C-alpha cells in the first residue's frame, strides 16, 4: 500500500527543473576575498534522468533571479548586496 507506484515515481524523477542548492563561490569564482552568508542559494536547475544513455537533461530556457546575500570581508566588516543567478525555466531530454 505505502509504496510509490511506478507511474508516480517515473514522472517525478524524470528530467525537470528542480530546486537545487547551488554554492555561490562556485558560481562567482572570481570573488576570492569574500565569504558569503548564506554560502549557497536555492535555484531552479535541471535534474532528473532521461532513462536512456543516449540522452541527457539540458536547460532550454533560462532566466535570472536576484537575492540579497551578505558579503563578508574577513576582519574588515560586512554588507548586504544584491547578487544575480541563473535559473533554468525549462528542461528537455536531448541526445548526448
Amino acid at each position: 500500500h505505502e509504496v510509490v507506484k511506478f507511474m508516480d515515481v517515473y514522472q517525478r524523477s524524470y528530467c525537470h527543473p528542480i530546486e537545487t542548492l547551488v554554492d555561490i563561490f562556485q558560481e562567482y569564482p572570481d570573488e576570492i576575498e569574500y565569504i558569503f552568508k548564506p554560502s549557497c542559494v536555492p535555484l531552479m536547475r535541471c535534474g532528473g534522468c532521461c532513462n536512456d544513455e543516449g540522452l541527457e537533461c539540458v536547460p532550454t530556457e533560462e532566466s535570472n533571479i536576484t537575492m540579497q546575500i551578505m558579503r563578508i570581508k574577513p576582519h574588515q566588516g560586512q554588507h548586504i548586496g544584491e547578487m544575480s543567478f541563473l535559473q533554468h525555466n525549462k528542461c528537455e531530454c536531448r541526445p548526448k
Binding site: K37, M70, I72, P74, H75, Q76, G77, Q78, I80
Partner: protein
C-alpha cells in the same frame, strides 16, 4: 579570552530581540574578533 568568546556566541543565541538579520550579523562580528 575564549571564555569571553563563548559567552559572546552564547548571548547571540540567547537574545530574543535580534531578528535573523540582527543575529547573523552579530555573529559575524564575534568572528572578526574571534
Amino acid at each position: 579570552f575564549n571564555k569571553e568568546c563563548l559567552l559572546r556566541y552564547k548571548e547571540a543565541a540567547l537574545d530574543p530581540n535580534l531578528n535573523l538579520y540582527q543575529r547573523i550579523a552579530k555573529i559575524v562580528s564575534i568572528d572578526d574578533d574571534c
